[PDB]
Design an enzyme around this catalytic site. Structure first.
Site, PDB file in Angstrom:
ATOM      1  CB  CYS A  19      -0.949   0.025   1.194  1.00 42.62           C
ATOM      2  SG  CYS A  19      -2.270   1.283   1.002  1.00 42.62           S
ATOM      3  CB  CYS A  21      -1.217   3.928   3.864  1.00 39.76           C
ATOM      4  SG  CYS A  21      -0.946   2.293   4.617  1.00 39.76           S
ATOM      5  CG  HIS A 156      -9.143 -16.271  -0.555  1.00 37.52           C
ATOM      6  ND1 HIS A 156      -9.987 -17.232  -0.043  1.00 37.52           N
ATOM      7  CD2 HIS A 156      -8.242 -15.995   0.428  1.00 37.52           C
ATOM      8  CE1 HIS A 156      -9.589 -17.556   1.190  1.00 37.52           C
ATOM      9  NE2 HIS A 156      -8.548 -16.794   1.507  1.00 37.52           N
TER      10      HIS A 156
END
Ligand SMILES: [K+]
Ligand SMILES: [K+]
Ligand SMILES: [Zn+2]
Ligand SMILES: [Zn+2]
EC number: 3.5.1.98
Length: 386
Positions: A19, A21, A156
């Site tokens: 990310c 951030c 997934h």
């Protein structure tokens, strides 16, 4: 015995998926996972014993053996690629004035599944092409087995869905590729990450050529991702070739080695031998390791149990076994678990007598959960009958 017959897959390409951030504390699927593992492999003397490989990027064609053309163009390309795409495709990617803003201000596909706008497409394609590549060698028989230290994880991600930290289903892509290149081959996928590999199950659900066996915390639909009940056996031609060891009854008593060893003894190994696979891929998440608290686990499987599970699967398919990193983020637990799997891969044997904890009987929730597996799969497998 033959030296360098075991491969390891790793590259720093895969660390860049982060990310913007810049804070690993809200982002458990972080670069630290694979780096902290890589060096554990050195300090313990195992890397030197392996054919180490860098990997490569999957092509868009490889990705499309599993994923839709729109998913592939979404997560497999960069604006602006040196890519020769036709204008209708270009136009389609303009209609997605899309993205999701995360609370941290970085871009995501959903709250948990982050997107780095420079680096995530490369890292995801790299995880997928690396597992494909590690696997091809094993298939050619130029390697005996191997271990893929890859991120982001894959199991997934479904046909046209990125979710759960996953963008391309690296294992499922490898499976399809392998099968393209060796007609009529039969592939067994063992998924021991604590979460159900919903994308893998769905990819192969109607396909008798691939046997999928997942062990996962299920608890009546109330654990991420909610999928993979025991009665889901496959459909059409593939009816019987999907085995959900769906654990029920929650966290009490403790779920750990005796349950997993029992699941292998009673369900994984006997069905696997009856299937008789040409190659075994493992979705090898370590989030069922001791070290994960309630929300992302609650289980207590140990490094040696993962090692011994690896060792049993080596009895299959002439020894053709490929593990790919999936989930698991407690660093010491994933590093202990990886080391054990890697020793095991080299031909090290674990001594089941050595562990006093393995004298304990599987808890009743486990037994019950397995009874349901048995009861369902008695229709399809001789070793499950009566
Ligand atoms: K699983
Ligand atoms: K199948
Ligand atoms: Zn963030
Ligand atoms: Zn998981």
């Amino acid at each position: 015995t033959l030296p360098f017959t075991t491969g390891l897959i790793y590259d720093s390409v895969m660390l860049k998926h982060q990310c913007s951030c810049g804070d690993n504390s809200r982002h458990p699927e972080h670069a630290g996972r694979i780096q902290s593992i890589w060096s554990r492999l050195q300090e313990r003397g195992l890397r030197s014993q392996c054919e180490c490989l860098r990997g490569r990027k999957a092509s868009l064609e490889e990705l499309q053996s599993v994923h839709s053309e729109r998913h592939v163009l979404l997560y497999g390309t960069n604006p602006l690629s040196r890519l020769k795409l036709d204008n209708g495709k270009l136009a389609g990617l303009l209609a997605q004035r899309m993205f999701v803003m995360l609370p941290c201000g970085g871009v995501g596909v959903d709250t948990d599944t982050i997107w780095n706008e420079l680096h995530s497409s490369n890292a995801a394609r790299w995880a997928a092409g690396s597992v494909t590549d590690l696997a091809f060698k094993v298939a050619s028989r130029e390697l005996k087995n191997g271990f893929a230290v890859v991120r982001p994880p894959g199991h997934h991600a479904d046909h046209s869905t990125a979710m759960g930290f996953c963008f391309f289903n690296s294992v499922a892509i490898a499976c399809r590729q392998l099968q393209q290149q060796s007609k009529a081959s039969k592939i067994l996928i063992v998924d021991w990450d604590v979460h159900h590999g919903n994308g893998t199950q769905q990819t192969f659900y109607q396909d008798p050529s691939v046997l999928y066996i997942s062990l996962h915390r299920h608890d009546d639909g109330n654990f991420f991702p909610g999928s993979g009940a025991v009665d889901e056996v496959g459909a059409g031609s593939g009816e019987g070739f999907n085995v959900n060891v769906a654990w029920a009854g929650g966290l009490d008593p403790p779920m750990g080695d005796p349950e997993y060893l029992a699941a292998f003894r009673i369900v994984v190994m006997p069905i696997a031998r009856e299937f008789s696979p040409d190659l075994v891929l493992v979705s090898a998440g370590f989030d069922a390791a001791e070290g994960h608290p309630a929300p992302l686990g609650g289980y207590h499987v140990s490094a040696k149990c993962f090692g011994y599970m690896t060792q049993q699967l080596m009895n299959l398919a002439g020894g053709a076994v490929v593990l790919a990193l999936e989930g698991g983020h407690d660093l010491t637990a994933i590093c202990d678990a990886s080391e054990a799997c890697v020793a095991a891969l080299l031909g090290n044997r674990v001594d089941p007598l050595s562990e006093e904890g393995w004298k304990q009987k599987p808890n009743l929730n486990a037994i019950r959960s397995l009874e349901a597996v048995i009861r369902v799969h008695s229709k399809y497998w001789g070793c499950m009958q009566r």
